[PDB]
Amino acid sequence: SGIPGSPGRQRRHTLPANEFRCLTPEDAAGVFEIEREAFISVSGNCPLNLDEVQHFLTLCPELSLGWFVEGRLVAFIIGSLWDEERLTQESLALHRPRGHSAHLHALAVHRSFRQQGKGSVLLWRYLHHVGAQPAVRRAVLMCEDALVPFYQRFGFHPAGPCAIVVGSLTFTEMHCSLR
Amino acid sequence: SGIPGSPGRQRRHTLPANEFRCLTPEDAAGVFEIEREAFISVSGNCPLNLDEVQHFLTLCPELSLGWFVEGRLVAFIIGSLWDEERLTQESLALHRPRGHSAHLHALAVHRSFRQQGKGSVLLWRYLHHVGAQPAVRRAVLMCEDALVPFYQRFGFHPAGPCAIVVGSLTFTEMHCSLR
Amino acid sequence: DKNELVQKAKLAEQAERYDDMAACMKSVTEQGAELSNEERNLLSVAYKNVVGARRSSWRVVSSIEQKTEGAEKKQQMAREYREKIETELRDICNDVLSLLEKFLIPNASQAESKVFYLKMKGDYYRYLAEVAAGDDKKGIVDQSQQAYQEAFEISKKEMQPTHPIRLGLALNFSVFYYEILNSPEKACSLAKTAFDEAIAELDTLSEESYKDSTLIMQLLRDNLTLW
Amino acid sequence: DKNELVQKAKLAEQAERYDDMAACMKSVTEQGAELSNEERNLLSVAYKNVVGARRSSWRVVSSIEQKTEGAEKKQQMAREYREKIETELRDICNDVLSLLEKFLIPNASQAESKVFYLKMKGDYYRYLAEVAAGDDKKGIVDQSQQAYQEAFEISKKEMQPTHPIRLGLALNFSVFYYEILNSPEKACSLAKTAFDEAIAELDTLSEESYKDSTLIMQLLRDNLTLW
Ligand SMILES: CC(C)(COP(=O)(O)OP(=O)(O)OC[C@H]1O[C@@H](n2cnc3c(N)ncnc32)[C@H](O)[C@@H]1OP(=O)(O)O)[C@@H](O)C(=O)NCCC(=O)NCCSCC(=O)NCCc1c[nH]c2ccccc12
Ligand SMILES: CC(C)(COP(=O)(O)OP(=O)(O)OC[C@H]1O[C@@H](n2cnc3c(N)ncnc32)[C@H](O)[C@@H]1OP(=O)(O)O)[C@@H](O)C(=O)NCCC(=O)NCCSCC(=O)NCCc1c[nH]c2ccccc12
Numbered sequence: 006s007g008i009p010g011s012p013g014r015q016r017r018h019t020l021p022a023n024e025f026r027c028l029t030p031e032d033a034a035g036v037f038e039i040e041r042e043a044f045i046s047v048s049g050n051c052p053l054n055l056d057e058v059q060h061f062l063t064l065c066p067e068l069s070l071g072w073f074v075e076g077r078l079v080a081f082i083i084g085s086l087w088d089e090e091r092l093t094q095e096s097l098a099l100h101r102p103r104g105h106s107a108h109l110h111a112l113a114v115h116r117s118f119r120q121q122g123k124g125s126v127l128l129w130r131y132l133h134h135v136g137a138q139p140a141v142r143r144a145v146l147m148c149e150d151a152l153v154p155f156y157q158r159f160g161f162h163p164a165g166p167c168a169i170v171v172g173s174l175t176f177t178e179m180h181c182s183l184r
Numbered sequence: 185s186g187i188p189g190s191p192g193r194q195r196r197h198t199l200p201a202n203e204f205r206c207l208t209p210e211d212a213a214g215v216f217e218i219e220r221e222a223f224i225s226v227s228g229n230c231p232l233n234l235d236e237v238q239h240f241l242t243l244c245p246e247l248s249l250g251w252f253v254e255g256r257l258v259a260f261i262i263g264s265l266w267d268e269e270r271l272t273q274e275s276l277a278l279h280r281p282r283g284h285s286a287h288l289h290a291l292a293v294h295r296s297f298r299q300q301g302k303g304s305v306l307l308w309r310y311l312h313h314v315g316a317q318p319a320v321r322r323a324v325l326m327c328e329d330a331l332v333p334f335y336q337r338f339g340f341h342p343a344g345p346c347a348i349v350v351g352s353l354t355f356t357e358m359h360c361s362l363r
Numbered sequence: 364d365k366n367e368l369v370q371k372a373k374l375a376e377q378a379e380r381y382d383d384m385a386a387c388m389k390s391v392t393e394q395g396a397e398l399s400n401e402e403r404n405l406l407s408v409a410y411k412n413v414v415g416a417r418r419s420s421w422r423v424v425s426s427i428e429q430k431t432e433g434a435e436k437k438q439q440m441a442r443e444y445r446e447k448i449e450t451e452l453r454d455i456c457n458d459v460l461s462l463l464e465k466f467l468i469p470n471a472s473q474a475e476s477k478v479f480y481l482k483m484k485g486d487y488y489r490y491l492a493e494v495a496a497g498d499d500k501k502g503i504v505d506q507s508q509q510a511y512q513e514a515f516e517i518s519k520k521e522m523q524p525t526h527p528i529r530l531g532l533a534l535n536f537s538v539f540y541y542e543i544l545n546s547p548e549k550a551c552s553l554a555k556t557a558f559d560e561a562i563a564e565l566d567t568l569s570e571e572s573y574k575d576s577t578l579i580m581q582l583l584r585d586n587l588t589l590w
Numbered sequence: 591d592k593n594e595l596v597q598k599a600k601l602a603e604q605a606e607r608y609d610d611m612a613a614c615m616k617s618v619t620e621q622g623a624e625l626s627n628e629e630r631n632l633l634s635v636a637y638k639n640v641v642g643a644r645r646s647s648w649r650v651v652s653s654i655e656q657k658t659e660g661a662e663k664k665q666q667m668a669r670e671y672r673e674k675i676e677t678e679l680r681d682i683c684n685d686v687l688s689l690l691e692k693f694l695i696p697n698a699s700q701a702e703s704k705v706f707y708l709k710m711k712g713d714y715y716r717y718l719a720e721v722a723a724g725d726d727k728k729g730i731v732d733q734s735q736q737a738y739q740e741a742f743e744i745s746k747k748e749m750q751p752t753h754p755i756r757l758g759l760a761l762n763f764s765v766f767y768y769e770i771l772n773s774p775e776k777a778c779s780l781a782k783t784a785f786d787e788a789i790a791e792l793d794t795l796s797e798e799s800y801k802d803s804t805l806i807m808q809l810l811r812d813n814l815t816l817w
Contacts, residue, residue: 007419009426012308012339013315013362017589018582019538020486020531022411023376023404031581034565034574041570074404076579077527115575121401122373129191136192144191158657160191183192186646188653196816197809198765199713199758201638202603202631210808213792213801253631255806256754294802300628301600337430370667374654378647378675420605427604440597448605 020075025130028069028081033059035078036111043113050172052111053083057098061085061110065100067138068107070131072123080114080123082131092145092178094169107135107183109146128159136183143183147176156181199255204309207248207260212238214257215290222292229351231290232262236277240264240289244279246317247286249310251293251302258294259302261310263287271324271357273348286314286362288325307338315362322362326355335360365391372405381416385409392462397470407483410459414490417452421494424448449494456491460484474521475528481514482532485539492543504543511536524560525573533557534583541590551590558583592618599632608643612636619689624697634710637686641717644679648721651675676721683714690714701748702755708741709759712766719770731770738763751787752800760784761810768817778817785810 006015028036037055044051053061061083062069068084086104087096096108109131114124135141147167148156157163161179169176185194207215216234223230232240240262241248247263265283266275275287288310293303314320326346327335335358336342343357368387375384388406392398398406428441463484471477488507495503514532522529533553541550561580564572595614602611615633619625625633655668690711698704715734722730741759749756760780768777788807792799 007312007422009423010430012311013321015363015589017538017541018586019535020579021582022415023408026578029577029581032577035577038570038574073578075407075527076531076582077575078577079575117400126377132191133186142192158659181191184194186649188650189657194816196765196768197813198762199806199809201642202635205805208804208808211804214804217801252805254634254754255758255809256802257804258802296627305604367667370664371671374651374668374671377654378651378671380647380675416606420607424601424605427601437597440594441601444598444601444605448607 021073022075024073025070025127025134026073027066028062028071028078028083029066030059030062032071032078032081033062036081036083039081039113039115040111042116044111048172048174050174052171058083058111060098061100068100068135070127070134072127072130074118079118080127081111082109082127083111084109084131084135086141087145091164092147092167092169097169097171103140105140106143106145107131107138107141109144112146125158132159132181132183139184141183144181146179148179149174149176153177153179200252201254203252204249204306204313205252206245207241207250207257207262208245209238209241211250211257211260212241215260215262218258218260218292218294219290221295227351227353229353231350237262237290239277240279247279247314249306249313251306251309253297258297259306260290260292261288261306262290263310263314264289265320266324270343271326271346271348276348276350282319284319285322285324286310286317286320288323291325304337311338311360311362318363320362323360325358327358328353328355332356332358365394365396369402369405372409376405376408381409381412385413389458389462392466395466395470397472397476398467403476403479406462407479410455414452414455414487417448417455418490418493421445421448421452452494453491456487460487460491463487474517475526478514478517478522478532479528481510481517482528482535485511485514485532486535489535489539489543507539507543511539523571523573524557524564525576527573527576527579530557530561530576530579530583534579534586537583537586541586547590551587554583554587554590558587592621592623596629596632599636603632603635608636608639612640616685616689619693622693622697624699624703625694630703630706633689634706637682641679641682641714644675644682645717645720648672648675648679679721680718683718687711687714687718701744702753705741705744705749705759706755708737708744709755709762712736712738712741712759713762716762716766716770734766734770738766750798750800751784751791752803754800754803754806757784757788757803757806757810761806761813764810764813768813774817778814781810781814785814 008014008016033055036058040051040053065085068086069082071078071081084107085100086102087106087108088101088104092108097110112128132144135144146161147169153163156179159181161181164178164180167176167178187193187195212234215237219230244264247265249261250257251259263286264279265281266285266287267280267283271287276289291307311323314323325340326348332342338360340358340360343359346355346357348355368391372384372387375381375387388402388409391402392406424441424445428438428445431438431441463480467480468484471480485507488503488510492500492503492507511532515536518529518532537550537553540546540553558580565574595618599611599614602608602614615629615636618629619633651668651672655665655672658665658668690707694707695711698707712734715730715737719727719730719734738759742763745756745759764777764780767773767780785807792801
């Protein structure tokens, strides 16, 4: 926070303008509120509940990223590290510090900002953000069939059925090579 | 190292153009070299010998900073943390992790780049770099009387005789408040 | 074509060429049609970036200038360059202020839009105020305050304490009091009240209680901690 | 005034306004006097920054362009914007290349200066080659290679293996072979030989060994590790 002439002093804040930031545990409520609309309203299920969301943001916030429109969180990606080729049920609530794959637990864009290319900018951004981390050689996520062609535009490849079941839902596993 | 479209891949390097970087242990030989010309030739003594320089760069490279002119190191500042109000003899070879003051052990500009304002840009830069670090509330250094008026231009204040003797040399202590 | 301009604008934002992005959004605004929320964000972001660049260069060349003690000539170099930057800065402000007065505020149908553009009006007069001198200053500072005040007024009536736009205005308006008006106490009141009311609404557990503006709140408390 | 221009140039560098810094150094160069090492660095840095900005925007708008799915939908927008950026990029390169041909290389009295400006000549033709369209490309790539080759020639004769300028040329020249010429093997030879020779000289512990170019060497090995 540059104050020319005053080295250790931090400059006051004013409203920012579109930025990408790691999410904080305090941003958890805003995530779950988007998840209510985005996931819970269609399937009656969602990737992470508030507690689970807060967990990953306290444990590994650097594996998360959100697009903030002038201070408002409108799109996110909550992740953690995994240490196996395939995703398993138990990996939903696990973060493996010495893992090698960035496990994207949830990705969602606020309904009033969808179809503007913002979800893609975020995903691309996230792949670069985590790809830069010296141990993360791959990215993994599960999605329903409809979103498979979408994710292939980012380098993800179909890895068949995902061993993870959420409620009464089944998904296709996707793998994306990075470093 | 941005490769649009390839998230985990690092872009190839080409010659850079003027930058400020933390020094690495490998930059120690270049540091001692400037010190031979810059100090050993006038007083027959110098702040840090190669071993001592290498030590600080391995232990706390984040407390160091150099101006690199297109890949060439031409000016540096080797530092470490101190945890007392006044500098003592033993603080010359000491780095205190939980310290609160950035102890500038040596500051020098290559003879072919002096009087261009580059030493000032570096010092200012260093005060911002270390001042940003959450525990570093002050900066401390010793210099001969001639340089006292110079250091006051950066916020340093005369703190009387320094308790540290190098060879047959005595210096004035300087303190600079940061955060 | 309006679409092409928006498409090129979103392109320039990614290419990090904000002066281009602003030019595109300035053209879209000049077709007299009310901007969509997206187009509005694009315009705000383009300009916040275009001007912020100059503001940053200004602060540094000013610092350098006041630190050039003795050297009359080296100090005059910074003086002239700073002025060169101030003209650039002045033009940018007048640009958006004109856009505001001619298309943005007149077309503002909703209160959310009215407060956004009114805040934006206070914003640019503030930036203009950061470099003003002479008698021009007293006037600029009033212009800023009156736009901010009107937005604040509407904000209190039509927006929830946790609304991102209501909260954003709180932040900028309190900073206006703090550094432009030198009124620490009032500045802190503005900020604390806003933060506390937002916290109050959230403590009720309502789906309506935004939770989107977490950042603007952290920003507010940081400023408080600072002051 | 030459001094004022340099003073304003050092000012613009700090203010991060590299287009101004370049303009200042372009004027100094246009007074036909040989540049001091400082003025030379200032010119190199101004331009390396001015052009790097456009190169970066180019890479991103190009990526976006091929990615673009569908037909000539907004595929044509990126295409045009990319071309707009290419013209800007082209102009910058012709600017320094002209400066080089008219004042810089003709005034180069020492070999250190001759290799610096010759490398800089290869550099800008390389940047020009990165956006070179079809038939114009062949010629540009020869122009780059010939300047690089001449500099390399002089480098081997008048500079120590550890010299920052000799080493800098090694890096840029090997990358030229790697991505502009698609010659991995030759690219790696250039880089490896340069690194090894530098290491050799440092190994004899002699007084003439540089140790100022540590970074350029790490850069060289990183590239090797990469390839
Ligand atoms: C999809 C997304 C992020 C795109 O953003 P955007 O709207 O900004 O999109 P852009 O504008 O950037 O791009 C638009 C493109 O997105 C694609 N797309 C968008 N909607 C689509 C759809 N309905 N079907 C197929 N492709 C579609 C298209 O290809 C479309 O191109 P076209 O214009 O050519 O069609 C955004 O629309 C959003 O937040 N959606 C709701 C939440 C969600 O689904 N998260 C992804 C879960 S997949 C990842 C994940 O979170 N897994 C956890 C797995 C999970 C655990 N529990 C669950 C419970 C329920 C569901 C899932 C889970
Ligand atoms: C001084 C410095 C860094 C400025 O850089 P520059 O040349 O780029 O300067 P700028 O262009 O940025 O600014 C120029 C200004 O620098 C000041 N200045 C420069 N030379 C001066 C001089 N001889 N006397 C008084 N003021 C002078 C002036 O005020 C001058 O303004 P004027 O234009 O108005 O005069 C640069 O010239 C340099 O590397 N010098 C040699 C090494 C050194 O002395 N390190 C400082 C040791 S004091 C810190 C330190 O390392 N302590 C360890 C203590 C130590 C332990 N063992 C030792 C053995 C011997 C000596 C010291 C030690």
